[PDB]
Amino acid sequence: NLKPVDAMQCFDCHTQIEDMHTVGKHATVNCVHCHDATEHVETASSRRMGERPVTRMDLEACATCHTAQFNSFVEVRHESHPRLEKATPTSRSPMFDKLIAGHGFAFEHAEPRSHAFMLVDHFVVDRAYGGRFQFKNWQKVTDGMGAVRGAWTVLTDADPESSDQRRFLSQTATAANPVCLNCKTQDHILDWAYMGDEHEAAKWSRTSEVVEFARDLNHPLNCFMCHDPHSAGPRVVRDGLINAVVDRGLGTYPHDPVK
Amino acid sequence: NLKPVDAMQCFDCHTQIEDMHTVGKHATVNCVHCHDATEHVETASSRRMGERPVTRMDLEACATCHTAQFNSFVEVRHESHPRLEKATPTSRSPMFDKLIAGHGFAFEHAEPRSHAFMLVDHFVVDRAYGGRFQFKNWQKVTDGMGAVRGAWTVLTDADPESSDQRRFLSQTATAANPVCLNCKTQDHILDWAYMGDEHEAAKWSRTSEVVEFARDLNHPLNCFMCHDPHSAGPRVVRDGLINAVVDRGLGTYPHDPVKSEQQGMTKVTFQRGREDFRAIGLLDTADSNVMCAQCHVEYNCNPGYQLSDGSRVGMDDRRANHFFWANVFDYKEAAQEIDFFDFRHATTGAALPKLQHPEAETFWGSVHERNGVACADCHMPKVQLENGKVYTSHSQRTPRDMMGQACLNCHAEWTEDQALYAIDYIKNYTHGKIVKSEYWLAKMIDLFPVAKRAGVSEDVLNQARELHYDAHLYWEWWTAENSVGFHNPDQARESLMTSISKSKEAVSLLNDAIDAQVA
Amino acid sequence: NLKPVDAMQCFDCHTQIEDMHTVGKHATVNCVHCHDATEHVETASSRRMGERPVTRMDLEACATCHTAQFNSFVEVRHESHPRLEKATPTSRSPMFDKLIAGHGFAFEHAEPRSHAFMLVDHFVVDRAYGGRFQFKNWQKVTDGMGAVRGAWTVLTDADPESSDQRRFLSQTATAANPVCLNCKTQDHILDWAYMGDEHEAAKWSRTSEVVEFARDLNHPLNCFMCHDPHSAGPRVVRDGLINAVVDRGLGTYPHDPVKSEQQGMTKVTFQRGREDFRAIGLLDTADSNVMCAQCHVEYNCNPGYQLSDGSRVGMDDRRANHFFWANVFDYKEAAQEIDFFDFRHATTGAALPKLQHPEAETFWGSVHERNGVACADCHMPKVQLENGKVYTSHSQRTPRDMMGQACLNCHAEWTEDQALYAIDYIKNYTHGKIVKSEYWLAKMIDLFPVAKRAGVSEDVLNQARELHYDAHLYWEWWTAENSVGFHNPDQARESLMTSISKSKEAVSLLNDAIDAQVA
Numbered sequence A: 001n002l003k004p005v006d007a008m009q010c011f012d013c014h015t016q017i018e019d020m021h022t023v024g025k026h027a028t029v030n031c032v033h034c035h036d037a038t039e040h041v042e043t044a045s046s047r048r049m050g051e052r053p054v055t056r057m058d059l060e061a062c063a064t065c066h067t068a069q070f071n072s073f074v075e076v077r078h079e080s081h082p083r084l085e086k087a088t089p090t091s092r093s094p095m096f097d098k099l100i101a102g103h104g105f106a107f108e109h110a111e112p113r114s115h116a117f118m119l120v121d122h123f124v125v126d127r128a129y130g131g132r133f134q135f136k137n138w139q140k141v142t143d144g145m146g147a148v149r150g151a152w153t154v155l156t157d158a159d160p161e162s163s164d165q166r167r168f169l170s171q172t173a174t175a176a177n178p179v180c181l182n183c184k185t186q187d188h189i190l191d192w193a194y195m196g197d198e199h200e201a202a203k204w205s206r207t208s209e210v211v212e213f214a215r216d217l218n219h220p221l222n223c224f225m226c227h228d229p230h231s232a233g234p235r236v237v238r239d240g241l242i243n244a245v246v247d248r249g250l251g252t253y254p255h256d257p258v259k
Numbered sequence B, C: 001n002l003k004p005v006d007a008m009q010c011f012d013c014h015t016q017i018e019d020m021h022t023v024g025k026h027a028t029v030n031c032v033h034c035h036d037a038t039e040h041v042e043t044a045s046s047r048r049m050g051e052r053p054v055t056r057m058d059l060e061a062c063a064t065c066h067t068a069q070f071n072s073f074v075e076v077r078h079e080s081h082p083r084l085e086k087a088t089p090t091s092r093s094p095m096f097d098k099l100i101a102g103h104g105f106a107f108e109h110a111e112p113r114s115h116a117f118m119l120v121d122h123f124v125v126d127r128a129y130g131g132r133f134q135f136k137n138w139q140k141v142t143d144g145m146g147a148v149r150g151a152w153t154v155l156t157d158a159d160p161e162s163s164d165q166r167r168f169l170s171q172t173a174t175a176a177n178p179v180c181l182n183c184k185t186q187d188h189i190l191d192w193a194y195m196g197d198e199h200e201a202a203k204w205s206r207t208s209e210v211v212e213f214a215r216d217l218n219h220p221l222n223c224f225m226c227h228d229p230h231s232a233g234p235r236v237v238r239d240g241l242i243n244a245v246v247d248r249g250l251g252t253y254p255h256d257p258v259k260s261e262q263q264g265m266t267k268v269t270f271q272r273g274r275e276d277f278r279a280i281g282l283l284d285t286a287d288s289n290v291m292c293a294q295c296h297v298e299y300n301c302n303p304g305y306q307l308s309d310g311s312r313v314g315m316d317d318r319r320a321n322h323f324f325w326a327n328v329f330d331y332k333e334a335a336q337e338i339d340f341f342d343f344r345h346a347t348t349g350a351a352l353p354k355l356q357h358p359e360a361e362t363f364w365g366s367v368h369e370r371n372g373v374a375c376a377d378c379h380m381p382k383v384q385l386e387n388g389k390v391y392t393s394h395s396q397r398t399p400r401d402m403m404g405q406a407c408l409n410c411h412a413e414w415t416e417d418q419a420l421y422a423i424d425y426i427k428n429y430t431h432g433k434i435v436k437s438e439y440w441l442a443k444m445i446d447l448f449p450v451a452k453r454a455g456v457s458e459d460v461l462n463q464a465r466e467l468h469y470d471a472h473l474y475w476e477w478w479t480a481e482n483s484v485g486f487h488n489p490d491q492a493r494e495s496l497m498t499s500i501s502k503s504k505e506a507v508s509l510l511n512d513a514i515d516a517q518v519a
């Protein structure tokens, strides 16, 4: 069973978090629900991290207290046809192959399906990783909860001993790069600098080897993408959006300064 | 927004709570979710309460972190017909008025409906408070969430200026007493001493003015009746059950000492002024049989009379809050054990027992119980989701609404229709025997006036009255019990055949005696 | 093809009709749609009819221009169980035979079914015509359109050669009389003087041979019972209702003079030979409460006896066609007002009232009535169409078939299941009290023979008989009334508790008196 930690002690070095956590609707939610910081607290100073504390990115970290929202999220809409190619006469773009010729989407561009699958679908689509990643078998395509538990519980890698983007199947492309993943997961939220710029503190960036990056990512559409875990308040985390709205001054509604 | 308090400060005085809270699955749940104790902390000492802290008894205290279980619990099953009188030809007991004459249930006894309504239904039923309490209007009867929010959000009191039990409507009774409330709410859990004994720290007791008590109570079937709020572990809080299982050493399964040991109960006592005050029963396992047995049992919650001398047994007597914890074939002995009966039949003059919903005691020894099945497996199963985090349904209802999870996962050999057919075979058969039992009871009852007026002797009438006790017991158990035999079909059959046998004996005795007077 | 006539020629003699027809929404509707008056015009004078014109009373006279309303009206609700006896354990009045013993309804009293069948059902019910009239065969029972086309298209008469009321089947009664027909048809509207009084211009009256009258009648619930054919405006034609509202000055809402004034009735009288003959009641508004009250009321339509001296009150007496126009708590006074009762109970000998379907009087003062809701809002609502010309449904039936329009447009807070649950709460509760009322009535009734044979005094028996009147009234109102309390739940509850109270008083009186004779 979880044992609460002394959050006040954390706050002696984490004023920024203190100011969010103490005020919001998660003021009573102990840090142990999402962090394992025991060795960190033994080794840190206010100016030296010491041992890096663990931060949980899994959606079940929130499901314990918010099962209704979690279960509603993970539901699979079976009526949303899966792996349905758009470049067919009965889908969105009957002449897509002629029109898009020269682009990687020619290799495959399916209609979207339920959010639970976003990361796995990104990994397995024919245009992304040269067919490197596949469902473990064709039964796994139904397993929304499994995908949410983690991509690598339901997928395989054709060659764990290499990290290069290459084609494993003939009619695939290797369009995936690290930026893609920002719209599939935010497991890397503490390992990626704003915009994916190079940064001494970032394990991952725009220029990383995407296959290596992929292997470190597990969960789709994290709950905290819209909800700050500390304040419980509404937010966004996607760098490109913040860059447009704030950095570039365009605002949240570029056509309506009042709104 | 809630601001957490320092639990360690509490724990300095509350070691029992510390021991439970720090170890269980609520170790991270701050006290402020359920208690406002600021002035309490300012004024308490190690042994004196000081200012009393506020404790939330509302079910929404649990719903912010456990919305799925809450929403499941408050669901209203509209198919469970509401306010449906049992004493009608199309319900459970077509001849109930004749058979129960002399008892308050004659004024009204409806079938149960969804748990959300238990406290409001208790307050408004015609037999309880003389018609004092009523729904604000007839629309409010649908409002399960409203009832859960609080009884007094949906009800009115005919006379807020008086607190006596009296009839406001002509055909009502005032049977309600404080003991009843223990199976409707535990809002009073900190204001009621164990068993409802008199206690200097208890606002309320068995001898309280029930109307005043009623006004202090709001919520039905609190979440914490089955789950300790501190440890989150399984428990019971109902005093009468703890008394049977633990104080009287009968065990959680009186027929099975092995199962009783494996699935036992530990009585934990809380004190006021270093004197025992209240108690809970921590369960070894999440055993719904014992959880549901807090209420779905035959009990005394009422005054009565002694079998030995007919003297009154009032609310002040411990026997007014009693779990017999005995199956139908052990019940008479259990009633003799405490020298008690409920009422004298208005026509026959027989001392009789009043039986109430003995599901727990009936389930004992049944095929399902022997096989380790429990109430929840049929009545509040795990939810099955194609993709999702499993949780346990808290909508306690007939398995007919969830047969796949309630029956067919175990009974892989059956379709839903086959399983339903098996239920109905038992219920139809049992009901037939209930009806036949009532026929014979009624035949006997009707002979009493004839016999008395023909000058049949008191000795013969008393012989017949002794037979009436048994004829009644072995019938009423089954109109009281809600499964119409399903929970224990062989037992029902044996009992009801016994009832008929006893009535037939009495009918022969009385007819012969009448015929001898005429001759 | 119809050829129009010159209405101006008619209007020269028919100024009342001119005044109505030229102003209303039928000003363009030529007389030929409903009258063949050629020989009449040739032979009439200003004050003498001459040859009688033909007047169409069939509902198809309206169906060529109002097919939607006609087709809606003639629909058969198959879910409304047909020929279902009320004196059965699964219907409205399980103990009806014991309680009604002495009255003709003991021979048969079925639940109502769809309006198309009202006249045929009246003709064939076992209590009405001694079994004289029957469906041609058992297939015809389904044929609502056929019944509407004409009763005699679907029925037979066991003996066209005689016109006396007599029993053709052993267990029938001959309760039918001419007054009954006024709530089944108005085919006789031009052949029946106001109230059924003797009149030289009336073929039929209260004292007619009902079998002969029957043979002249064809159509149920004529469209013109609620709508004046000349003005197309709202009206009533039922004499007894006009008599209560207008002649007796009681108003359309006797409990509410303001509403009575706003929603009033104007009595229009038509003469024959310059003597008053017949009347209608034009309504200020299209008020379905008053329209439906032409029939859905407690009434006298039968001989009876005087309360004062027990003397017979025959069909010749005005009291044989009477609307009491009184709610259940005013009824006894209303019956005393005309010095009338219906029958003597076969067992108890009590003078008793016979109550019939008092929906209108029960609805008075209810929450819906006070809020301006009317019968049609729940029972014949406007049709809702995604694209279309709205019209009013004429299929008068339970709101369960059209809950969106009947209830949920107003009760936006409820789902259909919630609304249904609210209805059933009331009906279940009320029915329980009906059943308990019958239990206590039966208990009292059964004591009368015992008391009489034990030599209990006539004074005590008469005391009990006086209690029987009230016990009966406050019960039977509710088995007679079709909503099982829904129309006025608080009133039903108060009434039924009164019934039980009266029966209990009588039971105690009789048991004590019997016991004193034995002692």
Ligand code: HEC
Binding pocket: A007, A010, A011, A014, A017, A021, A026, A029, A030, A031, A032, A033, A034, A035, A055, A056, A057, A061, A062, A189, A190, A224, A229, A230
């Ligand atoms: C108890 C009071 C604490 C404290 C001291 C911290 N947290 Fe959290 N945390 C959570 C997640 C998903 C992240 C990733 C970043 C994000 O989603 O915004 C974090 C991150 C942090 C940090 C790092 C901040 C930074 O400098 O980048 C720190 C210092 C931190 N946390 C401290 C998730 C959760 C929770 C899940 C419900 C809860 C509870 C906490 N955190 C609680 C605390």
Ligand code: HEC
Binding pocket: A025, A026, A029, A030, A033, A061, A062, A063, A064, A065, A066, A223, A224, A227, A228, A229, A231, A232, A233, B028, B064, B065
């Ligand atoms: C995992 C990182 C999550 C996320 C994404 C959310 N929570 Fe919680 N939460 C908890 C409690 C007690 C409340 C307050 C309830 C109330 O009083 O209304 C909340 C509230 C939220 C919100 C709503 C915030 C708002 O300002 O409206 C949201 C969006 C939210 N949470 C998201 C309780 C818990 C937990 C119990 C220990 C844990 C774990 C979480 N929350 C985790 C998360």
Ligand code: HEC
Binding pocket: A137, A138, A139
């Ligand atoms: C009815 C038409 C179906 C469909 C829609 C599927 N199956 Fe089967 N299946 C069976 C076994 C033993 C396996 C392999 C299990 C394992 O090794 O883990 C499968 C596999 C599948 C798949 C995956 C195929 C792939 O190439 O990966 C799919 C999509 C699938 N099944 C669907 C066993 C059986 C049966 C036992 C007699 C029968 C019948 C079915 N499967 C039928 C179907």
Ligand code: HEC
Binding pocket: A108, A109, A110, A111, A112, A113, A121, A122, A123, A125, A127, A128, A175, A176, A177, A179, A180, A181, A182, A183
């Ligand atoms: C970087 C090159 C990538 C790759 C390889 C993929 N994505 Fe996305 N993606 C986003 C949204 C909103 C959807 C759903 C709506 C829609 O598809 O029109 C998707 C969907 C996908 C899929 C599934 C459908 C398909 O095309 O087959 C796949 C396989 C996929 N993506 C791969 C959103 C985003 C982003 C946020 C701005 C970004 C960045 C990416 N996607 C990037 C990529």
Ligand code: HEC
Binding pocket: A064, A065, B025, B026, B029, B030, B033, B061, B062, B063, B064, B065, B066, B223, B224, B227, B229, B231, B232, B233
């Ligand atoms: C109101 C008094 C209640 C009640 C009746 C329950 N809770 Fe909670 N609960 C919370 C968390 C984080 C857990 C652990 C989840 C997990 O790790 O599995 C629980 C657990 C429970 C249980 C399960 C206990 C077991 O031993 O199996 C039960 C029966 C339970 N709770 C009941 C979180 C919260 C809260 C968030 C702040 C609050 C409020 C509650 N719980 C309140 C209640």
Ligand code: HEC
Binding pocket: B077, B080, B111, B112, B113, B114, B115, B116, B117, B118, B119, B121, B122, B182, B183, B184, B185, B221, B225, B288, B291, B292, B293, B294, B295, B296, B375, B376, B379, B380, B396, B397, B398
């Ligand atoms: C342990 C999990 C159980 C289970 C399986 C059931 N109950 Fe109860 N119950 C109680 C009361 C007072 C009623 C009647 C409420 C009312 O009429 O207002 C009920 C009703 C039921 C039902 C019938 C539901 C229906 O749809 O008709 C069922 C199936 C049922 N119960 C099962 C009282 C209590 C308690 C006292 C506080 C407790 C504890 C339980 N019940 C527990 C359980």
Ligand code: HEC
Binding pocket: B108, B109, B110, B111, B112, B113, B121, B122, B123, B125, B127, B128, B175, B176, B177, B179, B180, B181, B182, B183, B294, B295, B296, B297, B298, B299, B300, B301, B302, B357, B480, B482
């Ligand atoms: C003390 C005299 C009372 C009164 C006035 C009521 N109760 Fe109970 N009750 C319990 C259970 C398990 C049920 C559901 C099962 C069933 O009804 O068979 C009920 C139900 C009710 C109702 C609704 C049904 C009805 O009879 O109309 C009402 C109005 C009611 N009760 C009133 C359980 C218990 C107890 C636990 C052992 C005790 C104590 C009481 N009830 C006490 C009373």
Ligand code: HEC
Binding pocket: B059, B062, B063, B066, B069, B070, B071, B073, B221, B222, B223, B224, B225, B226, B227, B286, B287, B288, B291, B292, B376, B390, B391, B392, B393, B394
């Ligand atoms: C009042 C609305 C509540 C809430 C918020 C919870 N409970 Fe219960 N609960 C009961 C039983 C038999 C179980 C299953 C135990 C098992 O088989 O292991 C549960 C379980 C829970 C949980 C744990 C998660 C889950 O859903 O399995 C939680 C969080 C929970 N409950 C919350 C039994 C009862 C009762 C006895 C009649 C009553 C009362 C409650 N539960 C009430 C509530």
Ligand code: HEC
Binding pocket: C025, C026, C029, C030, C033, C061, C062, C063, C064, C065, C066, C223, C224, C227, C229, C231, C232, C233
């Ligand atoms: C057979 C006796 C009937 C009855 C009962 C009714 N009608 Fe007619 N009707 C016709 C037309 C042109 C109108 C006006 C339509 C409009 O402008 O709205 C009506 C109207 C009515 C009403 C509504 C009156 C009101 O004041 O709201 C009613 C209740 C009504 N009718 C009843 C036309 C015809 C015919 C065509 C030749 C014939 C035939 C009928 N109506 C017959 C009848």
Ligand code: HEC
Binding pocket: C077, C080, C111, C112, C113, C114, C115, C116, C117, C118, C119, C121, C122, C182, C183, C184, C185, C221, C225, C288, C291, C292, C293, C294, C295, C296, C375, C376, C379, C380, C396, C397, C398
């Ligand atoms: C004014 C618009 C109304 C409304 C709302 C109702 N009626 Fe009548 N009704 C009459 C008779 C003789 C019967 C029984 C017919 C038979 O059994 O053959 C009825 C029946 C009903 C019902 C029940 C319908 C069902 O589906 O069972 C209902 C809901 C109803 N009525 C409502 C007699 C008359 C009249 C005498 C000529 C008049 C006028 C009305 N009814 C009017 C209305």
Ligand code: HEC
Binding pocket: C137, C138, C139
């Ligand atoms: C299926 C179970 C049914 C039901 C519900 C009915 N029938 Fe028949 N039926 C047939 C014939 C030739 C007649 C007589 C036709 C006539 O001479 O007018 C009937 C009659 C009836 C009735 C009326 C009974 C009465 O006693 O008056 C009823 C209610 C009825 N039927 C219903 C012919 C046939 C069949 C031809 C093989 C069969 C099959 C049915 N009927 C079946 C049924």
Ligand code: HEC
Binding pocket: C108, C109, C110, C111, C112, C113, C121, C122, C123, C125, C127, C128, C175, C176, C177, C179, C180, C181, C182, C183, C294, C295, C296, C297, C298, C299, C300, C301, C302, C357, C480, C482
């Ligand atoms: C004069 C003695 C009679 C007879 C023989 C019948 N009626 Fe009526 N009737 C009226 C209404 C509103 C209904 C429907 C509501 C209900 O039945 O409760 C009926 C119904 C019938 C039926 C069918 C039902 C049954 O009892 O079997 C029959 C056979 C029947 N009636 C015969 C309304 C009225 C009146 C208006 C005030 C009057 C007058 C009558 N009925 C008179 C008689």
Ligand code: HEC
Binding pocket: C059, C062, C063, C066, C069, C070, C071, C073, C221, C222, C223, C224, C225, C226, C227, C286, C287, C288, C291, C292, C376, C390, C391, C392, C393, C394
């Ligand atoms: C015999 C089949 C008929 C026909 C052809 C019509 N009516 Fe009626 N009618 C009644 C009520 C209460 C209304 C609604 C009045 C209102 O709320 O304003 C109507 C309305 C009509 C209309 C007008 C158009 C419309 O559909 O709204 C028409 C053309 C019409 N009716 C024709 C009430 C009654 C009755 C009282 C019990 C009876 C009888 C009839 N209607 C019969 C018929």
Ligand code: HEC
Binding pocket: B137, B138, B139, C367, C368, C371, C373, C377, C378, C399, C405, C406, C407, C408, C410, C411, C419, C420, C422, C423, C489, C490
């Ligand atoms: C369709 C047949 C229904 C049913 C099932 C109900 N109504 Fe109504 N209703 C309306 C109003 C304004 C009230 C009072 C509102 C208030 O003052 O609080 C009601 C009341 C009720 C009740 C309660 C009755 C009681 O005696 O307390 C019930 C059970 C009920 N309704 C059910 C308004 C309307 C309508 C507006 C035109 C109509 C239509 C309905 N109600 C219909 C129905």
Ligand SMILES: [Ca+2]
Binding pocket: A080, A081, A111, A112, A113
């Ligand atoms: Ca889609």
Ligand SMILES: [Ca+2]
Binding pocket: B080, B081, B111, B112, B113, B114
């Ligand atoms: Ca029920």
